[PDB]
Amino acid sequence: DPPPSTLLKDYQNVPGIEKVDDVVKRLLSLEMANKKEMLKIKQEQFMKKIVANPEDTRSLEARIIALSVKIRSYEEHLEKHRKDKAHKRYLLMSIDQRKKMLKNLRN
Amino acid sequence: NEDLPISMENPYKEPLKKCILCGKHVDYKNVQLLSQFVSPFTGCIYGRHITGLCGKKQKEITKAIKRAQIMGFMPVTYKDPAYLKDPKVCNIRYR
Amino acid sequence: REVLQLQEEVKNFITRENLEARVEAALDSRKNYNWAITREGLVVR
Amino acid sequence: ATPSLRGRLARFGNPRKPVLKPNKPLILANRVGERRREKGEATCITEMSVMMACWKQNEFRDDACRKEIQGFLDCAARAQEARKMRSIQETLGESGSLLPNKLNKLLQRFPNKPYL
Amino acid sequence: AKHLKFIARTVMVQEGNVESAYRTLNRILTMDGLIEDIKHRRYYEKPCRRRQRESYERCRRIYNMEMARKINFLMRKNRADPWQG
Amino acid sequence: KFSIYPPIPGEESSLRWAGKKFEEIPIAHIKASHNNTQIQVVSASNEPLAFASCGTEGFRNAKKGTGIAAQTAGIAAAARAKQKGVIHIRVVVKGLGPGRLSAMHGLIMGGLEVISITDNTPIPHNGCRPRKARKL
Amino acid sequence: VESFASMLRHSPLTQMGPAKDKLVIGRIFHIVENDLYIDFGGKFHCVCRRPEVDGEKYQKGTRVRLRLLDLELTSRFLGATTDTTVLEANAVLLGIQ
Amino acid sequence: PRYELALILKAMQRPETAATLKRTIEALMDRGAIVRDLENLGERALPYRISAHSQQHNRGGYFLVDFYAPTAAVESMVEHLSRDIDVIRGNIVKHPLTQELKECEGIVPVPLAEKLYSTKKR
Amino acid sequence: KNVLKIRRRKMNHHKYRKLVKKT
RNA sequence: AAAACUCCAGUUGACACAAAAUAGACUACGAAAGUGGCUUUAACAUAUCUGAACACACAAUAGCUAAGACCCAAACUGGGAUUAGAUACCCCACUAUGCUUAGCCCUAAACCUCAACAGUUCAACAAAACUGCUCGCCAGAACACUACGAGCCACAGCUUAAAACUCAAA
Ligand SMILES: [Mg+2]
Ligand SMILES: [Mg+2]
Ligand SMILES: [Mg+2]
Ligand SMILES: [Mg+2]
Ligand SMILES: [Mg+2]
Ligand SMILES: [Mg+2]
Ligand SMILES: [Mg+2]
Ligand SMILES: [Mg+2]
Ligand SMILES: [Mg+2]
Ligand SMILES: [Zn+2]
């Protein structure tokens, strides 16, 4: 649950975020864009908190955290749309795959 | 040995011909263009074999036509009379 | 390099005090998006 | 100009659903369909309309109907002559559209083959 | 209705040539596909037989176009046989 | 050189009829169908000038939907129009029918001058559902 | 001794290139009263119509210059495992010699 | 993201038109939007008549705005301009040029399909 | 192809419907 | 042809919770059922494969429960026709219903009747013949989308599913 005013993923290495205007920082905040920006910021936070080597999406833990954030996205979407059978099926399949890979990771 | 052929591309290849709008951009506001791409009398949209452009651009311009119609920039039944004295791109035979 | 364009375009972005001049300038000005194209693909206005 | 048929039919390698479902197998036949009539001949209707008009005006006065009755007879004769003309025209050969007989002759002089 | 009158589906008479006017009119209407639509919308057309009619018409168009291509391709070959024997 | 397209209220229209502009010319209206066709004449300002039909002419159920009845109705309406002082006319046709093409010839024989022909036939964009198909 | 590869590399056709949009001189070997067949080069002859201008000036051994589309007319249809041929070649003439 | 508002209002005089424009931009700022620029399409006779909230209008002024705003601003502004009477229509859309055009290499020739039917003498 | 068995099942199901309507 | 309406019909002006010409000769999305008017929001699983008829989630139209909606169509019904007879085909009027809500039922020629995965080049008809692995299904016709039993918000049902008698065919 990151704040809304946090700038996008891509605009972090650039050092011009401090020198640039406040309105520019606002429109660069992820709250303006769609929620997939928020989701990638979330998964970056999780990979930085957990994973020893970031920038490695091939890893089982990276796949797992990606599926977890996607699952929470689908949960919110279903709670707004109780009648979305397609997203409900997608959520169920995603949870099943997540448990499969949790099993093999435990192994 | 030297006179023998060799694996090589065909420089006789004619470059892939591009439609009149393959590279250009289309919007829901260029009522001139979007009226060139429709029948004058009935207001029916000319299909691909009448128009002569790629499917992506046909889809773009037809969606833009519907958007302009519902928005108010263009009518549905009668083509705008002011855009009649413009280049005829879409081929026909009735005249 | 991409940041610099919209950084400089902030000056073009209207605000409250710029409103009561930009509105008048725009409604006094006129602009169109219409343009046609011929058989070979040449733009014509 | 012709439309493509890559994945229109129900084929084994065609994953998605089929588009076309022709009853008979689509192969180029070596004979062309033969021409048909258009409709049932009709004519002189306006002539007999003028005739009935003048009739109901003048109470069947033929020496006064002379004009339109002569026009009606002449139009009937013209239509019959035109039928004979178009008949002999179709016999001698349609202009612009070649005859199905010679077309089939050409197709069977050089027909297509679906087999090897 | 609320659209303006006498722009669409119109044809201007010249020299009182009503027959040629109506001929051009029905020609353009058929080329746009309007009389067909009207005569088919007289009665309701179910989706299943609509799809069947549409697929049959597609295949008919394909076959007729290819036949016409071959006819235009082989009209030149129909000439006086040069080598009789 | 001739323009098949009709004029526009916006200038310029270099073609008048009887010293009058295209817009104010009266309108003939035709409603065609399978069994009967109805004809009417109206001024440019909605004022109905003349009206008649095959039924008023005295044709029966089998024969209302024919070309000869349309011709007779056109003759009668043209007679009324010439009596009221109308020469030129703009044609408007609505729907298919046998006497559709015949009504125009009827008007011409009656002695009117059609300058334009308009087909304001109904086309629904899948709006309403018609009746079910007949099994003959 | 010279290899067929060398003779092909130095052949007139390899330097000719695409047959379309190219002039060529040719002569006729058989001629019907209405049309004439030019043997110009390659495999096939090209059949042509006698022009309205200079009608009689067409006899055996006449060197006529003309362009051509392709040296063989073919086309593959929907049920043709092998493309139909014409055994001829399309060509258009605009001069002689 | 970017949002283009196509605005169609009734033909009326410059003072009240500018009043409507400034109050609309004030609504944008209240919702939290940031205006990029204003584009005037101009006054034109509408192609087809429209029945507004209370009247019918044949002529109309077309204006266009491009701005940045969150998602809820879209619906809020839609209901705002729907309650508004001076405006005949207002439609929010996204920017076309934001969709970077896929590089085109021309139209490929479609060879006629084959092997739909087996090799049989029949 | 032939549908004789389909018609057999048809009349079976119809007679069963009638039987259930009666009983 | 009859019957029906004349509070009817034609032009013109205002008006919907109904269904979305042309584009579409396009072959795209979705696991399937399905999806082709416009704008916005959210969103379109798994970077080995298979895999539950011991589960879960869906599942066209039709149908059921309680509110609402009314252009049109229409089972049923009524009337008019035809017929020896017509409980139908033809015509006119109208109803459940088709639509939006919160639920239920869980079936189709649900078929493209061609299983998923990775690949190669002949009984007949059909959409050419095949290889390696995997799950599911089948064993004469009919009795049988049946009886009994067991489960389901379903109670004229749905799913599973036989047996006796008969025949030498199907
Ligand atoms: Mg079949
Ligand atoms: Mg279509
Ligand atoms: Mg229901
Ligand atoms: Mg009801
Ligand atoms: Mg289906
Ligand atoms: Mg099956
Ligand atoms: Mg399986
Ligand atoms: Mg059943
Ligand atoms: Mg049962
Ligand atoms: Zn293109």
CA torsion angle for E4, E6, E10, E14 (degrees, to 10)? -160
Strand intervals (E) in E10-49: 10-12
H or E, element range at G64: strand G64-68
Instruction: Please tell me if residue C12 touches chain A, with a CB cutoff of 8 Å.
Output: no
DSSP 3-state assignment of F38?
A: strand
CA of E20 to C1' of J2 (A): 42
Alpha carbons E54 and B23: distance in angstroms, whole number: 33
CB E74 within 8 A of CB G88: no
- Residue keyed to tokens 């739909």: H116
CA of I13 to C1' of J155 (A): 20
CA distance H106 to chain D (A): 16
| Assigned token pair, G39 | 């043997």
CB F6 within 8 A of CB E10: yes
Residue entry with tokens 């957990």: A50
Give the CA distances from residue G47 to residues A99, E71, E84, G74, G87, in Å, rounded to whole numbers and listed in that order.
Answer: 76, 18, 17, 15, 10
Say if CB F92 and CB F30 are below 8 A apart.
yes
Measured CA to CA, the distance from residue E63 to residue E57 in angstroms comes to: 10
What are the tokens at G46? 């090209």
Structural element, H or E, at residue G68: strand G64-68
Rounded Cα–Cα distance for residues B18 and F41 (Å): 53
Per the entry, the structure determination technique was: cryo-EM
E55 in Cβ contact with D19 (< 8 Å): yes
Q: For the stretch B38-56, what's the b/e string if a residue is b when 16 or more beta carbons lie within 10 angstroms of its beta carbon? A: bbbbbbbbbeeebbebbee
Helix axes D45-58, D62-92, angle to 10 degrees: 170
The kind and range of the H/E element at E73 are helix E47-74
How many C-beta atoms surround the C-beta of residue D49 within 10 A? Answer: 21
Question: In the 8-state DSSP scheme, what is residue A7?
Answer: B
Alpha carbon distance G53, G39 (integer Å): 21
The three-state DSSP-derived secondary structure of D19-71 is: CCCCCCCCCCCCCCCCCCCCCCCCCCHHHHHHHHHHHHHHCCCHHHHHHHHHH
| F23-60 b/e (C-beta count within 10 Å ≥ 16 → b) | eebbbbbbbbbeebbbbbbbeeeeeebbbbbbeebebe
What homologous superfamily does CATH list for H2-94? Ribosomal protein S6/Translation elongation factor EF1B (3.30.70.60)
**Residues 6+ away with beta carbon under 8 Å from D74:** none
Classify A2 as helix, strand or coil. coil
Max intra-chain CA distance, chain G: 50
Pairing of strands F113-119, F88-94: parallel
- Determine how many CB atoms are found less than 10 A away from the CB of residue B78: 21
Three-state secondary-structure class, residue G75: strand
Question: Can you give the residue range of the structural domain that contains F92?
Answer: 1-136
For C26, list phi and psi in degrees, rounded to 5: -70, -45
Chain G hits for H114, Cβ within 8 Å? 76, 81
CA C27 – CA H16 distance, rounded (Å) = 12
d(CA H76, CA H82): 10
F13 and E CB contact within 8 Å: no
* Chain centre distance of CA H55: 23
Contact (Cβ atoms closer than 8 angstroms) between residue D105 and residue D98: no
C-beta of residue C3 within 8 angstroms of C-beta of residue A16 = yes
Helix residue spans in chain A (DSSP H): 22-28, 35-50, 60-80, 85-106
Give all chains having 3 or more CB-to-CB distances under 8 Å with chain B: C, E, F, G, H
What is chain A's Cα-based Rg?
16
Q: How far is CA D115 from CA B77, G86, H111, H115, in A?
A: 51, 20, 20, 11
DSSP G22-61: EEEEEEEEEE-SSEEEEE-SSS--EEEEPPSTT-S---TT
Q: Name all contacts of H44-47 with Cβ < 8 Å and 24+ positions apart.
A: H46/B72, H46/H8, H47/B72, H47/B73, H47/B74, H47/B75, H47/B80, H47/E3
- The whole-angstrom separation of Cα H66 and Cα B74 is 21
Q: What do you get for the CA distance between the two ends of chain B, in Å?
A: 62
CA dihedral D86, D88, D90, D92 (to 10 degrees): -140
**Residue G71, SS3?**
coil
Rounded Cα gap, residues H106 and B20, in angstroms: 11
Q: Calculate the CA dihedral of residues F44, F45, F48, F54 and round it to 10 degrees.
A: 40
Specify the long-range contacts of residues A94-101, CB closer than 8 Å, at least 24 apart. A94/A67, A94/A70, A95/A71, A97/A67, A98/A64, A98/A67, A98/A68, A98/A71, A101/A60, A101/A63, A101/A64, A101/A67
How many residues belong to chain G? 97
Number of H helices, E strands in chain H: 2, 4
Distance of alpha carbon F90 from alpha carbon F114, whole angstroms: 6
User: Nearest nucleotide (C1') to the CA of residue A93?
Assistant: J45
Spatial separation of the C-alpha atoms in residues A37 and B81, rounded to whole Å: 47
In strand J, which positions have an atom below 7 A from any protein CB? 1-2, 9-16, 18-34, 37-47, 51, 56-59, 71-75, 89-92, 98, 102-103, 109, 112-114, 125-128, 141-146, 156-157
Q: What are phi and psi of E63, to 5 degrees?
A: -65, -45
* F36 Cβ neighbours under 8 A, 6+ residues apart: F53, F54, F55, F64, F65
Task: Report the alpha-carbon angle A52-A56-A59, nearest 5.
Answer: 85
Distance between CA G36 and CA G50 in Å, rounded? 7
Specify the residue for token string 């060197």: G63
Interchain contact C6–H (C-beta under 8 A): no
* Nucleotide with smallest C1' distance to residue I4 CA: J170
Determine contact, residues E75/G73, Cβ cutoff 8 Å. no
Q: Distance from residue I8 (CA) to nucleotide J142 (C1'), in Å?
A: 10
Q: With b meaning 16 or more CB within 10 Å and e meaning fewer, what string describes D50-66?
A: bbebbbeeeeeeeeebe
Hey, of G74, G81, G85, G86, which one would you mutate to test binding to chain D, going by the most D CBs within 10 A of its CB?
A: G81
Amino acid at D115: Y
For helices F67-84 and D45-58, the axis angle rounded to 10 degrees is 60
Tokens of C19: 């409103």
| Burial (0-12, 13-18, 19+ Cβ within 10 Å), G47 | buried
- The domain limits of chain H are 2-94
Dist CA G86 CA B41 (whole Å): 44
Q: Return the C-alpha torsion angle E20, E21, E26, E31, nearest 10.
A: 90
Q: Is the peptide bond before C40 cis (omega within 30 degrees of 0)?
A: no
Q: Closest Cα to residue A29, out of H70, H75, H96, C6?
A: H70
- In total, the C-beta contacts within 8 angstroms joining chain A to chain C are 15
Chain D neighbors of F75, CB-CB under 8 A = 53
Domain count, chain B: 1
The answer to whether the CB of B31 falls within 8 A of the CB of B73 is: yes
Chain A hits for H34, Cβ within 8 Å: 23, 26-27
Tokens of F129: 């559902």
In one-letter notation, the amino acid at residue A11 is Y
Strand partners, G68: G22, G91
Rounded distance from Cα H110 to ligand 1 centre (Å): 27
Given a contact cutoff of 8 angstroms between Cβ atoms, the answer to whether B72 and E9 are in contact is: no
Distance CA C40, CA F102 (A): 45
What is the amino acid identity at position D102?
K
Residue B7, domain extent: 1-95
Compute the distance between CA of residue C15 and CA of residue H35 in angstroms, rounded to an integer: 8
Question: Counting runs of H as helices and runs of E as strands, what totals does chain F give?
Answer: 4, 5
Q: Check if the beta carbon of residue G41 is closer than 8 Å to that of residue G24.
A: yes
Count CB atoms within 10 A of the CB of residue A42.
19
Q: Within a 13 Å sphere around the CA of F133, how many CA atoms are in the beta-carbon half?
A: 11
CB count in 10 Å sphere of residue C24:
13
- Measured in Å, residue H67 CA sits from the centre of ligand 3 at 44
Q: Which residue type, as a one-letter code, is found at position G53?
A: V
Residue F31 structure tokens: 């409603």
Q: Determine the Cα–Cα distance for residues H59 and H81; give it in Å rounded to an integer.
A: 19
CB pairs under 8 A between A and H: 11
Angle at D51 (CA atoms; ends D45, D54), nearest 5 degrees:
145
Backbone angles phi, psi at F73, to 5 degrees: -65, -40
Q: What whole-number distance in Å separates Cα of residue A89 and Cα of residue A69?
A: 16
What six digits make up the tokens of G36? Answer: 């004439």
Q: What tokens does H3 get?
A: 């949002």
The Cα–Cα gap between F108 and D19 comes to 51
DSSP, collapsed to helix, strand or coil, labels residue D98 as coil
CA distances from E48 to A10, D86, F125, H20 (A): 51, 43, 19, 52
Tokens representing A38 are 């928020």
CA nearest to F101, candidates F76, F74, F83, F64: F74
Q: How far is the CA of F88 from the C1' of J7 (A)?
A: 36
